[PDB]
Design a protein around this ligand. Structure first.
Ligand code: FES
Ligand code: FES
Ligand code: NI
Ligand code: NI
Lengths: 99, 99
């Protein structure tokens, strides 16, 4: 597992990025009760790294505009596959990304 | 140098496609005074062939949605360069594309 920071950090920063054995990870809130979502930000269209835009509640790809929900669900093309995701575990405020 | 059809054909069909020594060409109307425009429909982003949508007066790329005006001018990204164009000559109602 990869410790990407605390729930307090996620709150203050809006997101937490990390590097895992299976690729990059960006952790964002996925609700208001502590739910979080860890996605591999590699756009499923042409591999650009997507950018979490909290004001719109979506990841937006800077290369061709694909958009994804906090869960990684594709919301707008040209990507047609959801972002890969990672299971997470919060252990005493620490956000742990698995795999 | 490449005869793609007549103005009547262009009016009835909306566009005329052809092949030239410098690549494909799509000829579309560019006004109501008989003005026409010949572009190389190869999208300047990643090379997909853009498609003329007469109702919207634009070439729309089916791959990532870039749009171009009848003149080839880029109107919407991700493309950032205009479509190459070809000089044209209307000779006796015949549309000649010079490549
Ligand atoms: S790489 Fe993300 S939309 Fe193309
Ligand atoms: S190939 Fe035309 S927008 Fe990408
Ligand atoms: Ni691109
Ligand atoms: Ni593509």
């Amino acid at each position: 597992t990869v410790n990407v920071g605390t729930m307090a950090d996620l709150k203050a920063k809006g997101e937490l990025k990390g590097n895992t054995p299976k690729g990059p990870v960006t952790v964002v809130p996925n609700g208001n009760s502590g739910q979080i979502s860890a996605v591999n930000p590699t756009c499923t269209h042409n591999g650009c790294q997507v950018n979490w835009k909290k004001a719109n509640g979506k990841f937006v790809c800077p290369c061709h505009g694909a958009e994804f929900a906090a869960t990684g669900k594709v919301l707008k093309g040209p990507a047609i596959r959801d972002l890969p995701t990672y299971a997470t575990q919060v252990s005493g405020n620490n956000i742990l990304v698995k795999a």
